[PDB]
Chains A and B, each alone.
Chain A
Amino acid sequence: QSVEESGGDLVKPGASLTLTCTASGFTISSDYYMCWVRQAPGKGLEWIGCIYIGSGTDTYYASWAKGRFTISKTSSTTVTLQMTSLTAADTATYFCARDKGWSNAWGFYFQLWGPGTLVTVSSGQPKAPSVFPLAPCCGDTPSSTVTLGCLVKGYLPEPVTVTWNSGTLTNGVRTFPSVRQSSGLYSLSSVVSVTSSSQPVTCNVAHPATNTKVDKTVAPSTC
Chain B
Amino acid sequence: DPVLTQTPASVEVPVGGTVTINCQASQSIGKYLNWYQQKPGQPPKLLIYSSSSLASGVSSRFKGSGFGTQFTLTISGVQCADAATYYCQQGYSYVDLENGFGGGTELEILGDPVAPTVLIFPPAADQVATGTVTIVCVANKYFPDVTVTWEVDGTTQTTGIENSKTPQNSADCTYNLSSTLTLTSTQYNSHKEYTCKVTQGTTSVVQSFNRGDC
Contacts and interface: CB of A to CB of B under 8 A. Distances in A.
A169 interface: no
Contact of A176 (B32, B50, B178): B178
B190 to A, nearest CB: 18
A107 B49 contact: yes
A137 B91 CA distance: 57
A164 interface: no
Contacts of A188: 164
Contact of B104 (A45, A116, A178): A45
Given A108-B93, A174-B176, A137 B138 contact: no
A213 B31 CA distance: 51
B34 interface: yes
B162 A177 contact: no
A110 B44 contact: yes
A107 B31 CA distance: 9
A108 B30 CA distance: 12
B97 A60 contact: yes
Nearest to B99: A47
A45 B120 CA distance: 37
A111 B49 CA distance: 9
Of the four ranges (under 10, 10 to 19, 20 to 34, 35 or more), the interface on chain A belongs to 35 or more
A174 B166 contact: yes
A191 B154 CA distance: 27
B100 interface: yes
A114 interface: yes
Given A109-B49, A137-B214, A138-B209, A46 B32 contact: no
Contact of B91 (A108, A132, A138, A174): A108
A35 B138 CA distance: 40
B180 interface: yes
Given A132-B126, A147-B119, A222 B214 contact: yes
A149 B38 CA distance: 29
A32 interface: no
Contacts, number: 147
A106 B134 contact: no
Nearest to B122: A137
B121 A136 contact: yes
Interface in A140-191: 147, 149, 151, 153, 174, 176-179, 181, 187-189, 191
A88 B138 CA distance: 32
Given A132-B124, A137-B209, A149-B136, A62 B99 contact: yes
A97 B45 CA distance: 11
Contacts of A132: 123-124, 126-127
B76 interface: no
B136 A134 contact: yes
A128 to B, nearest CB: 14
Contact of B50 (A45, A107, A110, A133): A107
A115 B45 CA distance: 11
Given A113-B43, A136-B209, 5 more contacts: A63-B96, A106-B50, A107-B91, A177-B41, A222-B214
* Shortest Cβ-Cβ A-B pairs, 7 listed: A113-B43, A137-B214, A109-B49, A60-B94, A107-B91, A134-B121, A107-B32
30 contacts: A44-B103, A45-B36, A46-B99, A60-B95, A105-B50, A106-B53, A107-B34, A107-B49, A108-B32, A108-B91, A108-B93, A109-B91, A110-B36, A110-B44, A111-B49, A113-B43, A113-B44, A113-B45, A116-B43, A132-B124, A135-B121, A136-B122, A137-B209, A138-B209, A176-B164, A176-B176, A187-B134, A191-B119, A191-B178, A222-B124
